[PDB]
Amino acid sequence: IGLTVEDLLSLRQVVSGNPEALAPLLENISARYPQLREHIMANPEVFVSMLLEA
Amino acid sequence: NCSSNEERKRRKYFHMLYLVCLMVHGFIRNEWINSKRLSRKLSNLVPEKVFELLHPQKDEELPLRSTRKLLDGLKKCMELWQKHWKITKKYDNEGLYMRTWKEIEMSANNKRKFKTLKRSDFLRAVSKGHGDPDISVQGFVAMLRACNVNARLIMSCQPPDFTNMKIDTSAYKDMVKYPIFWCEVWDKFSKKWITVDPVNLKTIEQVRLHSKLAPKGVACCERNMLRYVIAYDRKYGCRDVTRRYAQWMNSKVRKRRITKDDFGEKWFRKVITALHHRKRTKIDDYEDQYFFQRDESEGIPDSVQDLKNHPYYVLEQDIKQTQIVKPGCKECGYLKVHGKVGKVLKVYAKRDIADLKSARQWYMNGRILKTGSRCKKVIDERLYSFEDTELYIPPLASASGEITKNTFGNIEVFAPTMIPGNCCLVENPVAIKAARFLGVEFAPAVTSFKFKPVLSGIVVAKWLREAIETAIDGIEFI
DNA sequence: TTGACTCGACATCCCCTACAA
DNA sequence: ATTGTAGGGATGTCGAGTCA
Beta strands at B228-232 and B313-315: parallel, antiparallel or unpaired: unpaired
- Rounded CA gap, A31 and B203, in Å? 43
- Rounded CA gap, B121 and B127, in Å? 10
Beta strands at B238-240 and B228-232: parallel, antiparallel or unpaired: antiparallel
Chain-centroid distance of CA B103 in Å reads 25
* Structure-solving method: X-ray
Resolution (A): 3.3
- As beta bridge partners, residue B367 has B391
Between the two ends of chain B, the Cα-to-Cα distance in Å is: 55
- Rounded CA gap, B100 and B167, in Å? 11
- Rounded CA gap, B325 and B196, in Å? 45
Query: Is B148 within 7 A of strand C by CB distance?
Result: no
Sequence-distant contacts of B72-80: CB under 8 A, at least 24 apart? B74/B185, B74/B194, B74/B196, B74/B204, B75/B204, B76/B50, B77/B46, B77/B50, B77/B140, B77/B143, B77/B144, B77/B198, B78/B140, B78/B196, B78/B198, B78/B202, B78/B204, B80/B45, B80/B46, B80/B50
Beta-carbon contacts below 8 Å between A and B: 88
Contact B28, A16 (CB under 8 A): yes
**Torsion sign over Cα B171, B175, B178, B183:** negative
Of A13, A24, A40, Cβ closest to residue B116: A13
CB contact under 8 A, A16 and B104: no
- Rounded CA gap, B413 and B415, in Å? 6
Question: In one letter, which amino acid is B462?
Answer: K
CB contact under 8 A, A27 and B24: no
Contact B475, B459 (CB under 8 A): no
User: How many contiguous H segments (helices) and E segments (strands) does chain A have?
Assistant: 4, 0
Q: How far is A32 from chain B (nearest CA, A)?
A: 14
Kindly list the domain boundaries of chain A, sorted by start residue. 1-54
Contact B382, B375 (CB under 8 A): yes
CB contact under 8 A, B22 and A44: no
Going from the C-alpha of B176 to that of each of B67, B68, B95, B96, B195, the distances in angstroms are 30, 30, 10, 11, 18
If we measure between CA atoms, which residue out of B219, B218, B175, B180 comes closest to residue B96?
Answer: B180
- As beta bridge partners, residue B151 has B185
Our CA angle for B206, B222, B139, nearest 5°, is 50
Kindly list the domain boundaries of chain B, sorted by start residue. 1-298, 299-355, 356-391, 392-478
- The nt closest to B360 (CA vs C1′) is C14
Query: Is B448 within 7 A of strand C by CB distance?
Result: no
Q: What are phi and psi of B180, to 5 degrees?
A: -85, -40
Between the two ends of chain A, the Cα-to-Cα distance in Å is: 17
3-state secondary structure of A21: helix
Contact B198, B77 (CB under 8 A): yes
**Which residues in chain A have their CB less than 8 angstroms from residue B29's CB?**
16
- Rounded CA gap, B374 and B384, in Å? 7
- Rounded CA gap, B341 and B379, in Å? 33
H/E stretch holding B314 reads strand B313-315
3-state secondary structure of B390: strand
